[PDB]
Amino acid sequence: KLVLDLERMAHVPQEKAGPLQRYAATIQSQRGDYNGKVLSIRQDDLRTLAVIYDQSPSVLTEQLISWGVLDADAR
Ligand SMILES: Nc1nc2c(ncn2[C@@H]2O[C@@H]3COP(=O)(O)O[C@H]4[C@@H](O)[C@H](n5cnc6c(=O)[nH]c(N)nc65)O[C@@H]4COP(=O)(O)O[C@H]3[C@H]2O)c(=O)[nH]1
Ligand SMILES: Nc1nc2c(ncn2[C@@H]2O[C@@H]3COP(=O)(O)O[C@H]4[C@@H](O)[C@H](n5cnc6c(=O)[nH]c(N)nc65)O[C@@H]4COP(=O)(O)O[C@H]3[C@H]2O)c(=O)[nH]1
Secondary structure, eight states, rough: EEEEEEEEETTOOOOOOOHHHHHHHHHHHTTTTTTSOOOOOEEHHHHHHHTTOOHHHHHHHHHHHHTSSGGOOOO
C-alpha cells in the first residue's frame, strides 16, 4: 500500500513540491474525497511520479519516505 500523508506533503521542499501536490490533488478530487488527510495511490502512479521527477523509483520512494509523505510500508 502506497499511502500519501497530505499534511507532510505541504512540507516537501518547494522546488519538488508542485507536481506531486497537483497529482495528489487531482486524484483526491476525481474520487470526490475532498476532506481526506491521506491518499492511497496506484502502483502505476508511483512509476509515473518517478518519470515526472526523473528519479529511479527506488530513489523517489526513499525520498518520499524521508519527507514523511510515504510510510516505510510503501517499500
Ligand atoms: N477500491 C478501488 N476502486 C477502484 C480502483 N480502480 C478503480 N476503482 C473504482 O472504479 C472507478 C472508475 O475507475 P476509473 O475509470 O479508473 O476512473 C478513475 C480514475 O480515472 C481516477 N482516479 C481515481 N483515483 C485514482 C488514483 O489513485 N490514481 C489514478 N492514476 N487515477 C485515479 O478518477 C477516476 C474516478 O475514480 P473513482 O470516483 O474513485 O471511481 C473509481 C473507483 O470507484 C482501485 O484500484 N481500487
Ligand atoms: N484493473 C483493476 N485493478 C484493480 C481494481 N481494483 C483494485 N485493483 C488492483 O488491486 C490493487 C489493490 O486495490 P485496493 O486495495 O483497493 O488499493 C487501491 C486503492 O485503495 C486505491 N485506488 C487506486 N485506484 C483507485 C480509484 O480509481 N478509486 C479509488 N476510490 N481508489 C483507488 O489505491 C490503491 C492501490 O491501487 P493499485 O496500486 O492500482 O493496486 C490495486 C490494483 O492493482 C479495479 O477496479 N480494476
